[PDB]
């Protein structure tokens with residue numbers, strides 16, 4: 001068969017979790033997408049010559065209980081912590097999502113990537129230096145993305161897979 | 171005699187560790203204070219009817235080794251983990267400081283309080299809900315402070331003393 005990589009996309013509402021996931025899977029930018037819908041996506045891809053399966057959960061952060069969500073949070077191999085560069089509250093939210101991940105995984109060290117989405121916008125409230133500093137303090141990579149222009153979308157998910165690969169080394 | 175509560179004030183540079191400590195000890199707000207200076211302060215206070223002595227170290231987070239810092243870190247009874255409400259990087263820094271305290275104390279459970287300083291400022295990057303959520307996940311109290319207005323200053327140090335008191339109660 002093929003190696004599976006279970007990825008979970010987390011972050012504040014409206015950062016672009018769905019738009020980044022739909023861009024990667026379906027090669028389309030959603031101008032509007034139901035903020036309450038939480039779906040899983042499977043995509044066969046080639047990363048550094050490895051034919052592999054991506055099993056991605058696009059979380060919605062809803063109160064409603066979900067057996068599938070519980071599974072992905074506990075068995076998730078890598079997490080994409082997404083914030084919007086024009087939403088300071090979402091950047092501050094990252095540390096909560098990291099604490100939530102640490103809780104659901106029962107681990108201080110989880111493969112994860114910091115994603116600074118909406119890089120296409122000319123007005124920023126979170127600069128690249130602030131974002132790099134946060135990622136450096138966690139010891140994780142930082143990828144600037146735009147679901148609209150496709151900039152860094154593939155890079156964000158592939159770098160996360162590369163982070164999981166690093167943990168699988170011994 | 172007077173019981174001695176050894177407190178250590180930690181957090182990112184520029185959050186207001188020195189300004190909170192100088193406000194509590196000297197009743198003055200510093201607009202600027204040497205970021206490299208690390209000093210200890212002793213103050214006699216009455217907390218819930220207990221006349222006691224506060225032995226506070228205002229850390230500077232310098233790489234330079236300090237014998238005094240090492241002793242306050244290892245023997246410190248309670249820690250004030252300070253962030254600035256207009257500095258998101260400092261809020262994210264809290265987990266590193268909490269991990270540093272855990273390492274030097276060689277304990278998963280250390281009395282500590284989360285301090286959200288600069289409450290006087292009208293522009294925030296870290297809201298009260300986010301701060302309460304972080305403190306809830308650690309299981310420690312959260313106190314909003316302002317070294318400028320004196321709001322929550324006494325409350326932050328007194329709550330920390332109350333946290334040490336809780337740990338000193340028979341299991």
Ligand SMILES: Nc1nc2c(ncn2[C@@H]2O[C@H](COP(=O)(O)OP(=O)(O)O)[C@@H](O)[C@H]2O)c(=O)[nH]1
Nearest residue numbers: 013014015016017018019030031118146147148
């Ligand atoms: N300009 C811009 N808008 C984006 C980008 N990503 C998402 N959006 C928009 O932001 C809104 C929220 O996106 P959505 O994917 O639903 O966010 P979610 O709640 O995190 O899943 C939508 O109107 C998207 O079209 C981006 O990179 N640039």
Ligand SMILES: Nc1nc2c(ncn2[C@@H]2O[C@H](COP(=O)(O)OP(=O)(O)O)[C@@H](O)[C@H]2O)c(=O)[nH]1
Nearest residue numbers: 183184185186187188189200201288316317318
């Ligand atoms: N507005 C405001 N400024 C503060 C407050 N506390 C500290 N500052 C300012 O923040 C800067 C850094 O404070 P300082 O105590 O030196 O930070 P430290 O490096 O953590 O010790 C100085 O300009 C202080 O006057 C506060 O409560 N409100």
Ligand SMILES: [Mg+2]
Nearest residue numbers: 018034035060
């Ligand atoms: Mg969504």
Ligand SMILES: [Mg+2]
Nearest residue numbers: 019023029030
């Ligand atoms: Mg899209």
Ligand SMILES: [Mg+2]
Nearest residue numbers: 187188204205
């Ligand atoms: Mg200082």
